[PDB]
């Protein structure tokens, strides 16, 4: 209930069908602004900010409770329950893909379908598992973030966007810089520690994994891994575009996949 204001919950559009948009690391809900109008004619759309977003009062960030993604799940479920929404489709980017997976296990009847964008169950490499990162690489990210956040963010923004799209780089950089540096590092650490591989099979909801041609945080092989192990019906949809944030950088292309995924559930 109090979360509705704290996490800046917005509900827009019209319809039978409820769709939740949950943003990823380094953005707030405004990252959905370019795809949103492709949805609001036929869908009731719920948007909110993760507690770590810069647009949320930093005094509300609990460094203890949110050192596990379960707490982010608690927030999402609390919002949906407050809104008295019994069933929805869920679209999650980055960390929100993990949140969505976990939420669908916690409350199977609540989530009719999952759309996962820039999605991975584990970033650290394991035997025969290519997550894209070794421990030492992960630690260097943390060190970089701690020592010089502005420089790390300046470097990270173009890499994450990937494609040559100035407005997307500018918009991602703005929200990344809007985060408080210590909160940004904390969430980064929390996500890198997370390993959802062992619970993928517990997901029952049908799922669409969105894959782009190149993702700096997600190897091309992860989508196939997710399709293989997610416990429901999973389809991989392919965007002929480059980057980690297609909702920012290629909203038209992504819109068509979203409208395709959200037509039936
Ligand atoms: C929280 C989070 C952290 C990392 O993935 C961000 C990242 C990824 C790759 C590189 Br290089 C530098 C930073 C996420 O993307 O979900």
């Amino acid at each position: 209930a109090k979360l509705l204001q704290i996490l800046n919950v917005r509900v827009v559009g019209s319809g039978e069908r409820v769709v939740v948009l949950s943003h990823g690391f380094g953005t707030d809900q405004s990252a959905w602004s370019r795809v949103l109008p492709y949805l609001t004619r036929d869908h009731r759309v719920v948007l909110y900010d993760l507690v770590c977003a810069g647009s949320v009062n930093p005094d509300h960030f609990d460094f203890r409770r949110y050192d596990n993604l379960d707490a982010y799940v608690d927030d999402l479920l609390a919002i949906l329950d407050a809104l008295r929404i019994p069933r929805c489709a869920f679209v999650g980017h980055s960390v929100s893909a993990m949140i969505g997976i976990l939420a669908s296990i916690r409350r199977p009847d609540l989530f009719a379908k999952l759309v996962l964008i820039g999605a991975s169950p584990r970033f650290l490499n394991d035997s025969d598992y290519h997550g894209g990162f070794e421990l030492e690489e992960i630690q260097q990210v943390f060190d970089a973030m701690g020592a010089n956040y502005s420089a790390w963010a300046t470097g990270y923004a173009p890499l994450a966007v990937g494609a040559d799209v100035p407005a997307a780089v500018q918009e991602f950089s703005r929200t990344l810089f809007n985060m408080r540096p210590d909160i940004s590092l904390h969430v980064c650490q929390t996500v890198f520690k997370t390993d959802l591989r062992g619970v993928l099979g517990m997901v029952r909801a049908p799922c669409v994994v969105v894959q782009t041609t190149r993702d700096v945080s997600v190897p091309a092989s992860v989508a196939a891994y997710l399709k293989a192990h997610l416990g429901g019906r999973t389809t991989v949809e392919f965007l002929q575009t480059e980057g980690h944030l297609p909702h920012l950088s290629a909203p038209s292309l992504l819109a068509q996949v979203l409208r395709r995924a959200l037509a039936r559930y």
Side-chain angles (χ1 to χ4, degrees), residues 15-232:
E16 221 71 7
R17 303 173 274 154
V18 177
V19 179
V20 174
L21 302 185
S22 194
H23 72 77
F25 168 77
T27 69
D28 51 30
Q29 75 187 250
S30 71
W32 298 113
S33 66
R34 289 175 184 264
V35 301
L36 185 55
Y38 287 99
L39 300 182
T40 48
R41 269 174 60 103
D42 318 322
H43 303 92
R44 179 200 176 181
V45 178
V46 179
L47 309 98
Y48 77 105
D49 296 333
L50 300 183
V51 72
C52 58
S55 50
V56 176
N57 189 335
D59 292 346
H60 276 122
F61 195 80
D62 186 339
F63 291 100
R64 173 184 182 82
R65 179 161 65 94
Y66 293 105
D67 73 349
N68 192 293
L69 287 195
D70 292 340
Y72 287 84
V73 175
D74 292 351
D75 285 354
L76 169 66
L77 298 181
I79 289 170
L80 296 175
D81 285 340
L83 294 167
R84 304 185 57 89
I85 293 174
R87 190 158 184 77
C88 72
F90 178 95
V91 180
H93 173 251
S94 168
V95 59
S96 275
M98 293 172 137
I99 296 167
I101 285 165
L102 287 171
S104 69
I105 300 168
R106 187 96 62 85
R107 303 282 299 275
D109 300 326
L110 182 57
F111 298 94
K113 179 179 279 198
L114 303 185
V115 184
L116 312 172
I117 312 167
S120 171
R122 173 184 166 125
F123 295 91
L124 177 61
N125 295 325
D126 201 348
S127 83
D128 284 343
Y129 180 81
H130 185 39
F133 296 86
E134 296 288 329
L135 259 186
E136 296 72 26
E137 291 176 302
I138 296 165
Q139 187 57 56
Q140 289 281 345
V141 177
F142 297 164
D143 300 339
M145 295 187 69
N148 194 342
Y149 185 82
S150 275
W152 164 86
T154 297
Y156 177 56
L159 289 182
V161 170
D164 183 15
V165 186
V169 173
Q170 233 185 308
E171 276 158 32
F172 184 63
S173 179
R174 185 192 69 83
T175 51
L176 188 56
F177 269 97
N178 203 39
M179 303 184 59
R180 217 174 65 186
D182 59 328
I183 292 177
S184 182
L185 170 63
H186 187 272
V187 182
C188 195
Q189 291 167 334
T190 300
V191 175
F192 276 108
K193 285 180 184 200
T194 306
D195 189 348
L196 296 195
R197 294 179 299 167
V199 301
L200 293 184
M202 305 182 62
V203 172
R204 303 310 198 210
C207 176
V208 170
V209 178
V210 178
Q211 217 199 13
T212 69
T213 61
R214 302 236 86 186
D215 187 317
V216 69
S217 71
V218 182
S221 53
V222 174
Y225 182 91
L226 283 167
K227 183 186 176 76
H229 291 284
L230 279 170

Side-chain angles (χ1 to χ4, degrees), residues 40 132 236 260:
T40 48
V236 180
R260 201 175 305 129

